[PDB]
Design a protein around this ligand. Structure first.
Ligand SMILES: Clc1ccccc1C(c1ccccc1)(c1ccccc1)n1ccnc1
Ligand SMILES: C[C@]12CC[C@@H]3c4ccc(O)cc4CC[C@H]3[C@@H]1CC[C@@H]2O
Length: 276
């Protein structure tokens, strides 16, 4: 019951997702791994709380059948809390490159002025990265299954207090289709109120249009009473995700000001110029 414009819109989004989402992470290589007064000190207590919010163990399944497993250390007051940051930066950077390739291919995104493209990517790269991570999140084992790589959360009631983490469990519960995930990525990408956007009217009409398509898709393909208000639930999660984005952006910048680790691409997406 979708229009031909709506059907073509989903086809282009799914096409962009298929071409630019390395779901098996087969081309994520050369990444780093952990080794084998008062105003400058109040930061450390906040950075320490940020890093130990959600900790993950890391597993590498080699192509030969071997398995490396990394269990992170506990906070003992030193620099050991930063051990997984270089790897997290490399993985995030790899996801961001796929996100940027995703946007540049969508026709509605390609047609915007280049400055608005950059403004939209700077605003939504983290959110689309989290949306893609949720499709490989295993809520039964609490693990993000990224091909050869697995990231397992180290009861669980105090862990769902982490907002980003409650988001992953709640979004996974909705059991969305691939078409609904990619429509969420489009709605998040075309948020007309990111810092620096000029064509606020063009982006807003495009976003309302991806939302109408998602609303219509759900109405046509989900009559079950369990999917009542599913569209509104999805839109509420996108609002929460945008807020999680702002929280984690400040967490990153706090950690960056004290222990630099952001890659050049991460610096570009987060406004870091390269000079103190
Ligand atoms: Cl999102 C994610 C996927 C896979 C492994 C780890 C994480 C996580 C993260 C958060 C923001 C940007 C990149 C990765 C993360 C997932 C859920 C809740 C918090 C953080 N993470 C970074 C450090 N420890 C865990
Ligand atoms: C997830 C944290 C905030 C967001 C940080 C981030 C944010 C963005 C990004 O591209 C990578 C990372 C890696 C480290 C993350 C942090 C580790 C602990 C903290 O909670």
């Amino acid at each position: 019951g979708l229009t031909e414009e709506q059907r073509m819109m989903i086809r282009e989004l799914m096409d962009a997702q298929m071409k630019t989402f390395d779901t098996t992470f087969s081309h994520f290589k050369n990444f780093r791994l952990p080794g084998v007064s008062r105003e400058e000190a109040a930061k450390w207590s906040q950075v320490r709380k940020d890093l130990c919010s959600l900790k993950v163990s890391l597993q590498l399944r080699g192509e030969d059948g071997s398995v490396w497993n990394y269990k992170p250390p506990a906070d003992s007051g030193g620099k050991e809390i930063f051990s997984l940051l270089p790897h997290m930066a490399d993985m995030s950077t790899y996801m961001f490159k796929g996100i940027i390739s995703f946007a540049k291919v969508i026709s509605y995104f390609r047609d915007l002025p280049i400055e608005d493209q950059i403004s939209l990517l700077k605003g939504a790269a983290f959110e689309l990265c989290q949306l893609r991570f949720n499709t490989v999140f295993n809520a039964e084992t609490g693990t993000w299954e990224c091909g050869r790589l697995s990231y397992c959360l180290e009861g669980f009631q105090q862990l769902l207090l982490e907002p980003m983490l409650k988001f992953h469990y709640m979004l996974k519960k909705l059991q969305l289709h691939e078409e609904e995930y990619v429509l969420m990525q489009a709605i998040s990408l075309f948020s007309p109120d990111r810092p620096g956007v000029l064509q606020h009217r063009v982006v807003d009409q495009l976003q309302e249009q991806f939302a109408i398509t998602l609303k219509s898709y759900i109405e046509c393909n989900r009559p079950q009473p369990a999917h009542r208000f599913l569209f509104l639930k999805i839109m509420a999660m996108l609002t929460e995700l945008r807020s999680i984005n702002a929280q984690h952006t400040q967490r990153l910048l706090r950690i960056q000001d004290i222990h630099p680790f952001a890659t050049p691409l991460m610096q570009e997406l987060f406004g870091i110029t390269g000079s103190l």
